[PDB]
Amino acid sequence: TRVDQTPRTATRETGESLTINCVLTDTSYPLYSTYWYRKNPGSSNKEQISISGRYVESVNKGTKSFSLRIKDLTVADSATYICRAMGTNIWTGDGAGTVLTVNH
Amino acid sequence: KSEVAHRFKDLGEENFKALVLIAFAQYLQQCPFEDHVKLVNEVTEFAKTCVADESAENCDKSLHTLFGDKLCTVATLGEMADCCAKQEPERNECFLQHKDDNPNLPRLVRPEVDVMCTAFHDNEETFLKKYLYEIARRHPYFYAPELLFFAKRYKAAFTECCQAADKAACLLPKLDELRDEGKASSAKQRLKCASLQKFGERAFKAWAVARLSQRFPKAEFAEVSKLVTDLTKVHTECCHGDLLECADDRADLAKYICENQDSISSKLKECCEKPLLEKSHCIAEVENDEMPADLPSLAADFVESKDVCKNYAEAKDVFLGMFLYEYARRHPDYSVVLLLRLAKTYETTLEKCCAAADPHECYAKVFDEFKPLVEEPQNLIKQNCELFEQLGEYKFQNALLVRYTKKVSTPTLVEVSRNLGKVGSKCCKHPEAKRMPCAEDYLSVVLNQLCVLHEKTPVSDRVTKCCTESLVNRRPCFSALEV
């Protein structure tokens, strides 16, 4: 069982958008909950992301696919984004991360 | 893709060679040291061709295929020989079923200190590999990565003690400690494998949620769940004989933990500075973090909420996992087994109540059912610690000796009784709040070892019943037995 996160690297300019697409694979178990985390540049702690405003989640339990789109991109956003998936058995895994860089 | 090459690159030559040695010794428990050395060197030399070129012949074969072929080559040249005639995956399964915990092997007779120290000096590599082999073959379910840490501890003991005034005074005692720690660790590793091996993950995962939650109370449920998943993977691979995969996965977990300390525990700094084997061992033995400041009662979410049954029905394991996490994080003073009995009680009540027209009225006082369950181990510890404090270790052991012999082989009864006397000596010296976790958790190990010993030669019935009935109810089953 594994979670595939794409893209692992991204660079956008100010005012643009980013869509991170995660897939729960190699399992016979259904997808239950999804979690998105932000690890700031030069941070030793990841804080969970409250999906609101700019943050828009799209879930498809059949494909076992879940994606997060960030509407307006700003410099402040430059951070590592991690997706976490939990199956109905509680098997919990993380995608390899997305290192987004926002430039002007 | 060459798995062997990937494992070699990640583990490094030295660790790869040690792990291959342990793996072979844990299966070919009867074969001489020299036989194993030959096998290891051959495997390592081949791995190196794969490292240089993943496209080299046979480099793309699975580890089980390659390992079985290497072992099997020797075997053709009793029952072990039968496994060799099978094909993968049946062959691996066959070898796994043939890891006999005790087909008896004569106890180790250690050379004299002067001889050992000289051998250590003349050839540290071979000397240390020899010991790795001796321990591994005698303990087939010994957690591989841990054996590597013990090896570095044995190396340190010889390094320090061989240049001391009295070689024996320095060395012999350390060796005795390592031997004892080793047997204990091996017993714990057999308990974990037995759960995975028969029942599967849910039993192990339950234990893990409870233990990790007591240890990392500040961590969120999702984090604990993630850690249980990773730990289950490591443990599963080690238990089935996937030593390299397990070792690398354990290293990766320790790394993940260290890079996410702020989301796990404030007590990990010291460990995360250590060397790679010493770090994982430290993390594994890390003391419980302090629990969050003002934690609310579980009543609101697990008893009062209208969504109890809805949340339970939708994903039972998730809900129960959350119950276990919330209860455990709040109770580092409880044994893991007690916490598991509380979760089982909660599960049974919900399964019954949620079927009713008005579930809430039915499960409204569930927490009351917990009180008698909590008190039983508590009182049992109090009475036994009080009896130990009045008798002393020896007399205490003898009282236990008579008590258990009266209920249900003498050598086994002596050994278990002696160890039980030690539980007393170890645990009763600890403050009341820490007594349950050390006592019940260590007793569950001693009783599992007794079960294993009965299992090889089943002459008794009462013991097998208690042993295979319920893992969480092993001690109460056994404890409650009559003359």
Q: Cβ contact (<8 Å) for A44 and B222?
A: no
**Pairing mode, strands A79-87 and A98-103:** antiparallel
Angstrom distance (rounded) from CA B347 to CA B340: 10
- Coil, strand, or helix at residue B275? coil
- The position carrying tokens 């072992």 is B71
DSSP B119-171: HHHH-HHHHHHHHHHHHHHH-TTS-HHHHHHHHHHHHHHHHHHTTSSSHHHHH
- Phi, psi of B104, rounded to the nearest 5 degrees: -65, 135
Number of alpha helices (DSSP H) and beta strands (DSSP E) in chain A:
0, 10
Angstrom distance (rounded) from CA A30 to CA A47: 26
DSSP B195-227: HHHHT-HHHHHHHHHHHHHHH-TTS-HHHHHHH
Q: Cβ contact (<8 Å) for B318 and A45?
A: no
In 3-state terms chain A splits into helix, strand, coil percentages (rounded to 5) of 5, 55, 40
Q: Which residues contact B278 (CB under 8 A, 6 or more apart)?
A: B149, B152
The full 3-state SS of A58-90, as one line of letters, equals EEECCCCEEEEEECCCCHHHCEEEEEEEEECCC
B383 near B396, Cβ under 8 Å?
no
**Angle B335-B198-A89 from CA coordinates, rounded to 5°:** 70
Tokens for B270, please give them: 């010291």
Angstrom distance (rounded) from CA B308 to CA A98: 36
Angstrom distance (rounded) from CA A20 to CA B221: 24
Tokens for B196, please give them: 């995975």
Measuring CA to CA, how many Å separate B479 from each of B106, B379, B403? 32, 13, 10
Which residue of B226, B259, B318 is in closest CB contact with A84? B226
Q: Which helix (H) or strand (E) holds A48?
A: strand A47-48
Q: Which residues contact B38 (CB under 8 A, 6 or more apart)?
A: none
B82 near B90, Cβ under 8 Å?
no
Domains of chain B, by residue range, sit at 1-198, 199-290, 291-483
B127 near B107, Cβ under 8 Å?
no
- Coil, strand, or helix at residue A2? strand
* B304 φψ region: left (φ > 0), alpha (ψ -120 to 50), beta (else): alpha
Q: Does B245 count as an annotated binding residue?
A: yes
Q: Does B10 count as an annotated binding residue?
A: yes
Based on the number of CB atoms within 10 Å of its own CB, is B36 exposed (0-12), middle (13-18) or buried (19 or more)?
A: buried
The hierarchical CATH code for the domain B199-290 is 1.10.246.10
> Which residues from B are below 8 Å from A86, CB to CB?
222, 225, 318
Query: Residue A31 forms beta bridges with which residues?
Result: A87
Q: Cβ contact (<8 Å) for B321 and A90?
A: yes
Please give the DSSP secondary-structure letter assigned to residue B288.
P
Tokens for A37, please give them: 């985390």
Query: Residue A87 forms beta bridges with which residues?
Result: A31
Tokens for B388, please give them: 């130990």
Half-sphere exposure of B361 (CA within 13 A, CB side): 4
Q: Does B226 touch chain A (CB under 8 A)?
A: yes
Which residue of A45, A48, A89 is in closest CB contact with B317? A89
Q: Which residues contact B299 (CB under 8 A, 6 or more apart)?
A: B367
**Pairing mode, strands A79-87 and A65-70:** unpaired
Q: Cβ contact (<8 Å) for B229 and A92?
A: yes
Please give the DSSP secondary-structure letter assigned to residue A12.
E
The parent domain of residue A73 ranges over 1-104
Please give the DSSP secondary-structure letter assigned to residue B468.
H
Angstrom distance (rounded) from CA B229 to CA B308: 25
Taken as a whole, chain B contains a residue count of: 483
- The position carrying tokens 């233990």 is B211
- Resolution attained, angstroms: 3.0
Angstrom distance (rounded) from CA B348 to CA B353: 9
Query: Residue A94 forms beta bridges with which residues?
Result: A84
Q: Cβ contact (<8 Å) for B260 and A46?
A: yes
Q: Does B318 touch chain A (CB under 8 A)?
A: yes
Angstrom distance (rounded) from CA A13 to CA A90: 38
Q: What is the largest CA-CA distance in chain A?
A: 44
Please give the DSSP secondary-structure letter assigned to residue B109.
-
Q: Which residues contact B471 (CB under 8 A, 6 or more apart)?
A: B195, B199, B203
Query: Residue A58 forms beta bridges with which residues?
Result: A67
**Cis peptide bond N-terminal to A7, omega within 30:** yes
Q: Does B415 count as an annotated binding residue?
A: no
**Cis peptide bond N-terminal to B476, omega within 30:** no
B254 near B283, Cβ under 8 Å?
yes
Residue of chain A minimizing CA distance to B233:
A1
Residue of chain A minimizing CA distance to B256:
A94
Give the gyration radius of chain A's Cα atoms. Answer: 14
Tokens for A47, please give them: 């804080």
Closest among B389, B408, B405 to B460, alpha carbons compared: B408
Q: Which helix (H) or strand (E) holds A94?
A: strand A92-94
Q: Cβ contact (<8 Å) for A93 and B229?
A: yes
Q: Does B317 touch chain A (CB under 8 A)?
A: yes
Q: Which residues contact B330 (CB under 8 A, 6 or more apart)?
A: B217, B291, B295, B298
Measuring CA to CA, how many Å separate B313 from each of A86, A92, B307, B316? 17, 20, 10, 6
Task: Specify the number of domains making up chain A.
Answer: 1
A75 near A14, Cβ under 8 Å?
yes
Q: Cβ contact (<8 Å) for A44 and B259?
A: yes
Which residue of A35, A44, A94 is in closest CB contact with B261? A44
Q: Cβ contact (<8 Å) for B318 and A44?
A: no
B439 near B337, Cβ under 8 Å?
no
Q: How was this structure determined?
A: X-ray
Angstrom distance (rounded) from CA B479 to CA B400: 11
Rounded to a whole number of angstroms, the distance from the CA of B95 to the nearest CA of chain A is 26
Which residue of B202, B220, B315 is in closest CB contact with A32? B315
Tokens for B363, please give them: 């499960």
Intra-chain end-to-end CA distance of chain A, in Å: 39
Rounded to a whole number of angstroms, the distance from the CA of A95 to the nearest CA of chain B is 12
Angstrom distance (rounded) from CA B64 to CA B61: 8
Q: Cβ contact (<8 Å) for A90 and B220?
A: no
Residue of chain B minimizing CA distance to A86:
B222
Query: Residue A79 forms beta bridges with which residues?
Result: A100
B283 near B267, Cβ under 8 Å?
no
What are A's interface residues with B at a Cβ cutoff of 8 A? 32-33, 35, 44-46, 48, 84, 86, 88-94
- Phi, psi of B424, rounded to the nearest 5 degrees: -60, -55
Tokens for B35, please give them: 């036989």
Tokens for A12, please give them: 């956008």
Q: Cβ contact (<8 Å) for A89 and B229?
A: no
- The position carrying tokens 């919900």 is B350
Q: Does B313 touch chain A (CB under 8 A)?
A: no
A30 near A54, Cβ under 8 Å?
no
Q: What is the CATH number of the domain that holds A76?
A: 2.60.40.10
